[PDB]
């Protein structure tokens, strides 16, 4: 638990290396405030970057939200469950959607078939090549 805690101490402070590009964040704190500490490298906030980060965190929260809908519990207050009580009642495409499931899982369990490729090609090619160069 000691290393877990000490490294938790790292996974929050390290973001302050390249903290931001909008006046740094403070007018005091002379400890390399707005000169962001990735100066070892070679030699309001920006509205475009603002909107780009907003789109990024929007997709992030959308993924988190679908994850919480599917796997998250119900005894909490962040699974409204009214909609959940609806998207089983009038689920239209359940006959099709499940087949997508029947595909996607069938892929991931097959480990990204590329793995089986090297098996049925390489380690079964050399196994015959040795026999050939023996005969």
């Amino acid at each position: 638990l000691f290393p877990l805690l000490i490294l938790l101490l790292f996974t929050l402070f390290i973001g302050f290396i390249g903290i931001s590009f909008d006046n740094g964040g403070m007018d005091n704190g002379i400890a390399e405030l707005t000169i962001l500490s990735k100066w070892l490298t070679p030699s309001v906030n920006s509205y475009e970057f603002i909107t780009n980060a907003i789109s990024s965190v929007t997709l992030a929260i959308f993924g988190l939200f679908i994850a919480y809908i599917f796997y998250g519990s119900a005894y909490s207050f962040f699974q409204n469950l009214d909609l959940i009580n609806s998207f089983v009642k009038r689920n239209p495409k359940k006959e099709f959607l499940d087949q997508v499931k029947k595909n996607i899982y069938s892929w991931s369990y097959n480990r990204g078939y590329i793995d089986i490729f090297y098996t049925r090609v390489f380690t079964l090619g050399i196994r015959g090549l040795t026999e050939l160069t023996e005969f």
Binding site: F70, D98, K101, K102, Y105, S106, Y109
Partner: protein
């Protein structure tokens, strides 16, 4: 009416459920018709689901009515090394559409049961 009777998820004396089913489909869909749980503690999204496939997380134990199911495949013979000869996969297996006068009793997912202590 391939009359089915579920011995569900071992409980105190039995935990029987009743269900009238018209044969022809597989066991998976015919269970998910009578709303009785099959995929143990396995949830909707992606965890060991989606029907007729690989993982094998539906291991229904057949007790009565065994001589009415489709014969075993070889995927069943593969994913069930641990099996006693009794139970099968039920996700690649079917009941006969012409067996409308059957009588089949099924115990649900094993390895979460303490039974054959009964009868």
């Amino acid at each position: 009416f391939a009359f089915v009777s579920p011995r569900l998820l071992p409980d105190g004396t039995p935990d029987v459920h009743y269900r009238t089913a018209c044969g022809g489909q597989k066991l998976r869909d015919i269970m998910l018709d009578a709303y009785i749980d099959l995929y143990g503690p396995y949830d909707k999204l992606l965890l060991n689901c989606s029907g007729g496939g690989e993982c094998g997380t539906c291991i229904v134990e057949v007790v009565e009515g065994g001589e009415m199911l489709s014969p075993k495949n070889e995927v069943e013979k593969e994913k069930l090394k641990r099996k006693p000869k009794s139970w099968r996969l039920a996700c690649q297996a079917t009941v006969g559409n012409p067996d409308s006068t059957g009588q089949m009793v099924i115990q649900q997912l094993p390895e979460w049961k303490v039974h054959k202590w009964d009868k």
